[PDB]
């Protein structure tokens, strides 16, 4: 009986002029601080310049996109868009467990394509079991 | 009261000065426990009202910094 949705339109960022970076830093924000989140993301993607650009980050963001979730524990597809919010949430949630020094340092999990693919593998292994529904 | 002048009650000071001048005598009775111990109060016995009765205190030398009410407990817990 919510009867509506608005999807909350967004606005792109100056660097990389991309619309996914804005969603990523929005999920990265804490206590309503966007500037420091952008700073941390930029330091992280520049630290990732060891090995290309944010292309490798956005492709690593694909390996954490599940195709079916269990929610009598019935499996079902999630949505064509909630996939890139579960992927971002899982990446950001499991990048805060790395025992590195800084946030930009422990965010170096895009090259681990490492606690991010494990979640998708467990989801697929738990969804392929309850396939008779 | 806080290093702008030592606070001792006028009546208490006037009644202890004559006692210390006459020498050694009976206990001095008081209610104003808000007075600070003076070097004129040493060796003297004061019965100070506490909440209902008068507790005695014998100023030897060492309480010269504390008030006349730091002693004489007011609440009786166990």
């Amino acid at each position: 009986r919510k009867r509506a949705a608005k999807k909350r339109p967004l606005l792109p960022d100056p660097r990389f002029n991309d619309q996914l970076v804005t969603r990523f830093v929005n999920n990265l924000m804490w206590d309503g601080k966007k500037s420091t989140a952008f700073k941390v993301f930029y330091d992280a993607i520049d630290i990732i310049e060891t090995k290309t650009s944010l292309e490798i980050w956005k492709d690593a963001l694909t390996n954490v996109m599940p195709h079916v979730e269990v929610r009598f524990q019935i499996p079902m597809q999630i949505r064509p868009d909630r996939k890139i919010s579960m992927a971002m949430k899982w990446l950001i949630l499991y990048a805060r467990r790395r025992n590195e020094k800084s946030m930009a340092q422990r965010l170096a999990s895009e090259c681990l394509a490492g606690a991010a693919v494990k979640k998708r593998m467990d989801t697929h292994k738990m969804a392929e079991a309850n396939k008779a529904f | 009261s806080l290093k702008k002048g030592p606070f001792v009650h006028y009546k208490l000071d006037k009644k202890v000065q004559e006692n210390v001048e006459s020498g050694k005598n009976s206990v001095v009775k008081t209610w104003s426990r808000a007075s600070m111990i003076t070097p004129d109060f040493v060796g003297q016995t004061i019965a100070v009202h506490n909440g209902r009765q008068f507790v005695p205190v014998y100023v030897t030398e060492n309480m010269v910094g504390h008030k006349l009410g730091e002693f004489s407990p007011t609440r009786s817990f166990r």
Binding site: - | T60, N62, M63, H66, E70, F71, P73
Partner: protein, 113 residues
């Protein structure tokens, strides 16, 4: 080196390592360093012996040791052995500065008896 009795800076910064000595703290340590003339940003493992002695001479000015420890010990023993309110409060082990001996007195009372 051993500025105080047995304390060891051990490669920490000057101020952060000198504030490990009991009795001396951040403010007086900064004052000692500024009056003796050594940079606070530099470490301790490279200080020359002249600077070591110049800092020792000014650290031996304040009463910062077991001497001050037991000085405040005699202070509490003095206010205790005369029958003061603070004396009986220290003897029984409850907060002394007027805090409520009701809830939120754990760090002074102890665990659940």
């Amino acid at each position: 080196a051993r500025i105080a009795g047995i304390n060891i800076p051990d490669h920490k910064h000057a101020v952060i390592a000198l504030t490990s000595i009991y009795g001396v703290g951040k403010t007086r340590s900064k004052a000692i360093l500024a009056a003796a003339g050594i940079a606070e940003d530099v470490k301790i493992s490279e200080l020359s012996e002249g600077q070591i002695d110049t800092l020792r001479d000014e650290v031996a000015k304040f009463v910062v040791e077991g001497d001050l420890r037991r000085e405040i010990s005699m202070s509490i023993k003095r206010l205790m052995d005369l029958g003061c309110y603070r004396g009986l409060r220290h003897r029984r082990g409850l907060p002394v500065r007027g805090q409520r001996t009701k809830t939120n007195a754990r760090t002074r009372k102890g665990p659940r008896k």
